[PDB]
Every structure is written in structure tokens, then in C-alpha cells.
Symmetry: D2
Subunit: 168 residues, 4 copies
């Protein structure tokens, strides 16, 4: 039903925390985009399980893209994941990808430490163009403030915004 | 202490309601644009300014646009010699409601306000974009209502 | 065929000059939005609003030319566009929506505060406005200038204006 | 003295055509995204041109991974003056795509503006060009002209 595509870190990370507030209680598909060390910028995304991820995403009506804001954009893992949709749109193993994605609802959770409420707007507008291209309805988002793990818990505005993320 | 600069039409409209949610318990001064000099005199006396405007064509109301545009005259008015200095120490907020996916399509307007405030040296402390079509509709926008109620809180 | 909606100050104005170049040679319908008593010292007048609509409705290409005031369009252009809400339900112009949905739109905006960057929100606001109307946003020019004649120094803008249509 | 940081590949494609129009006559260094070696080469140039095809209304994945790594460089003891060195450089952006890029690529330009501002680098200019298939960029006369004059400080 609901999938959370996490392009941040895991266990404690501000991205994980905010996402849990948004999907609390649901039996949501939790996707974590893998990355291997070569810490921000110290990794390289791993996409060995990309097809498995697409398979899971296709079964979900609601998609929540959760990401830290790196250099005023999304994470390296989420950027390489979305860029690969270009390949999937030409993939015979997922012949109805465009149509299937077009009926889904999308949400975004992004956390940054440099006045995200303002400096994170270009990223939200970028997501707007991405979803519009796919015909996906961009239903809502949350911009949260945080630098180190767990500091999002101090952004009460973001915590309550995430809890009220899913439209009703 | 707090001034709500109302750019719509005083009539229990969605923008008015959302701004009231933000200032509940603060006993703010409500300035309805829709007497320019008196308005300027009144806002200069407030530390916090909340610009509340319905969203028209992905921007502010024509009333609020004519109001801010006239600041160009005030920046050179000898009766208000310290206008820019006084404004720069104020904290500004924006509350805007519209019926066409405003939380997403109203972002350019938020960026314009960011530039206006930065130009004046004012701190842009927060904003809330809300969704509504007919009066009262905003009371169903849980996310917006929650955000407005927390707008001016120092610790919640 | 082509219409230039000018929301600035005429003759010699940076906005007038760039628009002039964009439609140089063409027999374009020149629409100037009225205003009477310098920035912020006027009040737009729309007594001729209906005749202006009648004219743009006959043009396939619409060029919106405006100075950048407070990071937005001019007061006259803002009040003009805002009124489209009334026109969209006006018995006098039964087909406004459909007629506008087939026109091509362009924007020429001039500002004195690093417009190539600070004028982007305005261009994005125009993108939403045109998309709402079904109008194709074909291109734009962001010129730098604050005083009459200044736009003659922005050769990059004059070029663009020339290569706009 | 100047470097073109290409986030595409060496292929003589639309982004490369536009970038070349800008550095013609400058004998610029062409870097096609040896990370440490690349950082050393760019640190020696006072003008940096970031050239990238537009993917999903953003930069290429290759350029994204490169700029993201600056976070590591900002804390790398082997490059103790990285931030300071970059701050005195002039940055330009050349970006080409086939989905109404001059309009839909604006958020990307704003991101670059934030990236450069964070580094203290002067964002001197940019060109968004239209091109769907190889060679299409030659039809975008506005972009070709803008790229031609991008680094010029004289006219005719
Ligand atoms: Pt994080
Ligand atoms: Pt469903
Ligand atoms: Pt990473
Ligand atoms: Pt106060
Ligand atoms: Pt405005
Ligand atoms: Pt002018
Ligand atoms: Pt035509
Ligand atoms: Pt005016
Ligand atoms: Pt040089
Ligand atoms: Pt290309
Ligand atoms: Pt990017």
C-alpha cells in the first residue's frame, strides 16, 4: 500500500525518524537505498537490488521519498535511483511502468541543516517537475531541520508536519 | 507587538482564519489593507509582522502587491526617515491560502517574499501555505492549521 | 497576430526597448497598461480592460513585458492578470479559457538587482500562470537595468530579445 | 587558467557543443568526470564552467556524486584550504536537456546558486540550452549566442 523510499542513513537518522512519524502504524514497504564506503560523500550507491525495489514500488499506491538535503539537492543514492527511471521507462520487464507510476501519489520528506525551509525549496520544485513528468500527484512534503542524528526531534514543527503528512 | 497585515478582504476568509490560528493568544493588531500612511505608522511599531494574503495567480493579492510596491516611495519619504532601518529589525512571517495545490505551486511566491525581506534586511522567520476554496475550508487543512498554531512558538 | 502587453513605463524605458527589439519589424498589437499618479507612485486604471482583452484574444502570440518591482511583475501587469479570474466567468467573453489555451506566451522582464538569479521566482510564477491557462510558455529574457538606457549595456539581453521569437 | 567540468562523457554531444562555444579561443582544460587528481586540477583554475546534461530536472548523476564528495574534501587534511581556494573562483553553468529546460531547469540553476553561495564562489552566468537528440542544440540560436559570449567582457 505505502512505500517509504529512504535515501538517507538508517536507525536514528533524521530521515528515518521523520518517515516513521508519517507512516506510523501502517504496514509500509520500507526501502533503503544501499550505499557502500569508498561520512556524507564517503559512499558510492549500490544498485544491485534495483529491480527488486522497482517491483516493490509498483505494488504501492502511495510513495514517500525521504532524503537528506546534500548540497541543496537530494542524496546521491536517491538521485541515481530516480535517474535510472529513464532505463526502466525503456525496460521490457516493466512494460507498463509509466502508466503504473502515473496513478500513484507522491510525498517528500527532506532534512537539511542549512535553513531548509528556504534553501530546500528548489529541491521541492525539482521533485514537482519529476512527479509531474511521471503524472504522479505530488500530495505533500515536509522540510525539516537537522545536522546530526536525532536532532530532528528538536524540530517540533517538522515532527508534527510529518505526523500529519498523509492527506485524509 | 504583533501586526497581521491582511491583504485579502476582511470577511472570515480562509487566509484571515489561518492567520488568526497563528496569533491566537497573542492579541495581535489586525491591519486590513483592502490610509497608507497610517498603516505604515502602525506597522513600524510592531516587532513581528505577519503578511497574510490569499494566493491569486500563484502570487499575492493585488492589494498586497500595491502596498509593498509603495514601499519604494516610503524609502524616500522624509516623514519616515528610518523606515528601512526600523523594518530591518523586525521578524516577518507569511501566511497564504489558495485553492490550486498551494503548498507546492505557491513556492515561487515564498521565494519572492524571501527576496523582499532580505532586501529590507528583515528576518523571514516562517511561513505557512494552506489549502482552501470557500470560506472555512481551511479548517479542514490539518497540516496547515497545525503549522500555523506552531508558527510563533518558541518551545512546544 | 502578435501582441506585446507592456506593464512598464514607456519610451526610453528598458522594458520598452527590449520588447521593441523582440517584435521589431512585425506589426504587433501594442498594449500599454494605464496608470496615473516614481515607482509605487501610480495606481493602475483599467477602464479599457475589455478592449485590451478583445485585442489579445485576436493574437496567437502574447509577449508580457515588465520591469521587476520588488522581485515581482509591475503593479499594472499584476492587476491585469489578476482580473483574468473575473474574465474566466464573464458572459461577455464566453470562450476566454479556450481562446487563451492555444496562444504562445513569452516574458521580457528587467530588473536592477541581479535579475538572472533574483528574477527566477517571477519566471516560475509566470510558468504556473501560463500552465493554468493551457498557454505554452515559449521563452523569456531577464535583462539587467535600473535607469533608462541601461539595457543598452546588456548586449546579452538585447541579443536574447532579438533571438526570442 | 579555466576548466570545463563536464558531467557528461566525451562524445561531441549537445552539452559538449555548447560548452565548446563558450571556451573557444581560451584553450581551456576539459575535465570529463581520479577524484583527487581532478580536485588538484580545478584548484589551479580561476574560472570553472560546470557543464551538464539535464537529467530529471537536475544535473547528471556523475556531477552530483562529484559535488557531493566536496563534503569529504572540506574535511580532508590533504586539501586544508579547499574552501578558501574555491571562494575566489568565478563559476558558470552550462546545462542542456530536451524537456523545456529554459523553464523547467530553473530549480537546478537555483540549486547551483546555493551551492556556489555556500562556497563563497561568484556565480557569474549560466546558459540553459534545448536539445533532445545529438545535434539539436545547433537549432537553439539563443543558447549558442549566450554561450558564445559567456566569458567575453568586450562586445563588437
Ligand atoms: Pt540524516
Ligand atoms: Pt489506494
Ligand atoms: Pt552518499
Ligand atoms: Pt518581540
Ligand atoms: Pt506579488
Ligand atoms: Pt523601466
Ligand atoms: Pt500563429
Ligand atoms: Pt505602478
Ligand atoms: Pt584568465
Ligand atoms: Pt547532451
Ligand atoms: Pt543535482
Amino acid at each position: 500500500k505505502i512505500a517509504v523510499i529512504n535515501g538517507g542513513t538508517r536507525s536514528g537518522g533524521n530521515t528515518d525518524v521523520l518517515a516513521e512519524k508519517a507512516v506510523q502504524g501502517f504496514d509500509a514497504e520500507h526501502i533503503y537505498l544501499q550505499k557502500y564506503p569508498i561520512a556524507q560523500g564517503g559512499f558510492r550507491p549500490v544498485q544491485d537490488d534495483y529491480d527488486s525495489i522497482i517491483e516493490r514500488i509498483l505494488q504501492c499506491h502511495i510513495l514517500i521519498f525521504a532524503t537528506p538535503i546534500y548540497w541543496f539537492g537530494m542524496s546521491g543514492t536517491l538521485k541515481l535511483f530516480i535517474d535510472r527511471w529513464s532505463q526502466t521507462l525503456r525496460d521490457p520487464r516493466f512494460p507498463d511502468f509509466k502508466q503504473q507510476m502515473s496513478v500513484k501519489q507522491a510525498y517528500v520528506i527532506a532534512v537539511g541543516g542549512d535553513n531548509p525551509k528556504i534553501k530546500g525549496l528548489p529541491l521541492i520544485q525539482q521533485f514537482e517537475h519529476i512527479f509531474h513528468f511521471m503524472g504522479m500527484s505530488f500530495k505533500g512534503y515536509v522540510l525539516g531541520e537537522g545536522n546530526r542524528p536525532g536532532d530532528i526531534l528538536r524540530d517540533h514543527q517538522a515532527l508534527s508536519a510529518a505526523s500529519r503528512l498523509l492527506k485524509r
